């Protein structure tokens, strides 16, 4: 079995796994939408009660599985619980990361496309000071890029350039993964993560120097870091915080598990896992949280920044922020650095959520690494055409896989590992070879708190918010639901072919 060559490489690979578009696009929107500081107390608590414990669990299961030649959950789940149902629930460890990849890589290609056009200057005056005169040209620049529908039809007509940039983006993803763990993912991580950190820090400093009559970047930080306990009784804020923690740490994706399956059997995962987890949180709340919010707050104020955030998941990062930069000397180049930052962030994550299906084809169907990557890329490239042309197919998959799916799977893997497999032997697996030991308090959190917190969260979620979306959507949501259900059954069938091999 291939293994990471260095501890540093492993941590940066796993840090590049987590540090992605979630840190710089999702977290700002989630935080701004929920009162900044009002959002971070749940966020901090969710990290300590969900994020950290599940991080260790996923490392442990991956390492455990890798030791026996299996880095994906269909097999690992069966190793932890020899029941045919374990293999079927294990399929979600392939389905979630594949479905998330189908639209993640596309949004990743936007950041590359934008970056190219901002670098070359093919982008949309301060003499005009009315705001909408500055934001509309960037709204239209994005809407024309991805082809937002103008008429009654729910169809997207993405640019030719966007389509081509998508092809290039997958070619880049394949270029890395086709070289393996050590010489591929690990080598790119050691380059991308330094670059990512330097770009983010530079952007943070340029943003902190933004000042306008409606505020400063400082007002954005005090809005983000001013505690508030009015909404700590609000279910929506807790479910947003826990959803964000799952997504940003790549938990419930099966991706952490697959990476960890390439860690040597007796090599530490306790400190390593905690380091990658904490590195992502620093990149999230200090870098991600100090670019978009302070910029929008400084230029528009908090009320209008909160409105912008509520406007959409891409309004802030793809429209508002470049619009703000455009009012700065060299702002188009600053835009380039922002989207280049976003690209390396997403690319380091997209390669990680595609390797689960790659490792399944290598480990269970015994495909060569080369063919495993190409077939995986073809599956993602083809399926992405749903996301590229059907309006809001992106949202439907991000909901079932990237929001409901991750949480459901996170609770499933915990139950399999810590209840059925055995809390005491799971605890042994986590700490075996640990440089440090997991705080013994966390044994009880992982066994009783984390599952209760996720279980309670999923019912107040499933029987309150989702009946709304499950009843009055446009019929085209069924197209995406139909397709990703077919995907699940296709993967179930490969698991069936792998069991009988
Ligand atoms: C995988 C092949 C079948 C899927 C059909 C989608 C391929 C069509 O792709 C389309 O081709 C056009 C050519 O000008 C481009 O302008 C469009 O942006 C592109 O989306
Ligand atoms: C980074 C690689 C991008 C190569 C694809 C460029 C295709 C963009 O083609 C676009 O449409 C028309 C040409 O038919 C013209 O408006 C411009 O050449 C161009 O903006
Ligand atoms: C699934 C996404 C469909 C993408 C292409 O659907 C479009 O529909 C319109 C006719 O109603 C036309 O623009 C063309 O027939 C076709 O390009
Ligand atoms: C959940 C909150 C994180 C717990 C952090 C506690 O960390 C420490 O770990 C040690 C055991 O390993 C104990 O001896 C200490 O009392 C405890 O404070
Ligand atoms: Na992240
Ligand atoms: Na990443």
Author numbering: 5 to 128, 131 to 507
Show passages lifted from the paper.
LeuT, the bacterial homolog of hDAT, has provided key insights that have improved our understanding of Na+/substrate-coupled transport in the neurotransmitter sodium symporter (NSS) family. In the NSS superfamily, which includes DAT and LeuT, thermodynamic coupling of substrate and Na+ -co-transport occurs via an alternating access mechanism that comprises the opening and closing of the IC and EC gates. R445 is aligned to R375 in LeuT, which forms the R375-E6 salt-bridge as part of the IC gate. Previous studies of LeuT conformational dynamics have shown that the network of interactions between the N-terminus (residues R5, E6, W8), TM6/IL3 (Y265, Y268), TM8 (D369), and TM9 (R375) are key to occluding the IC vestibule in the outward-facing occluded (OO) state.
First, we determined the effects of substitutions at the LeuT residue corresponding to R445 of hDAT, R375 in LeuT: LeuT R375A, LeuT R375D, and LeuT R375C. In all structures (superimposed), L-Ala, Na1, and Na2 (purple spheres) could be modeled into their respective binding sites (left). These crystal structures showed that R375A and R375D substitutions in LeuT precluded salt bridge formation between R375 and E6, and between R375 and the backbone of I184 as was also observed with Rosetta modeling in Figure 4A. The distance between residues R5 and D369, and between residues E6 and I187, was conserved in all three structures (right bottom), as also found with Rosetta modeling. We found that both neutralizing and acidic substitutions at R375 likely promote the dissociation of the E6-R375 salt bridge (closest atom-atom distances: WT = 2.1 Å; R375A = 5.4 Å; R375D = 4.2 Å), weaken the interaction of R375 and I184 (closest atom-atom distances: WT = 2.5 Å; R375A = 6.0 Å; R375D = 4.7 Å), and decrease the thermodynamic stability of LeuT (Rosetta scores: R375A = +4.4 REU; R375D = +5.6 REU relative to WT). In R375D, the probability distribution of the dominant short-distance component (OO) decreased, such that more open intermediate distances were sampled in the Apo state (black trace) (left). Similarly, R375D suppressed the short-distance component (IO conformation) in favor of an IF conformation in the Apo state (black trace) (right). The addition of Na+ was able to partially rescue the probability distribution of the IO conformer, where Na+/Leu resets the IC gate to the IO conformation (right).
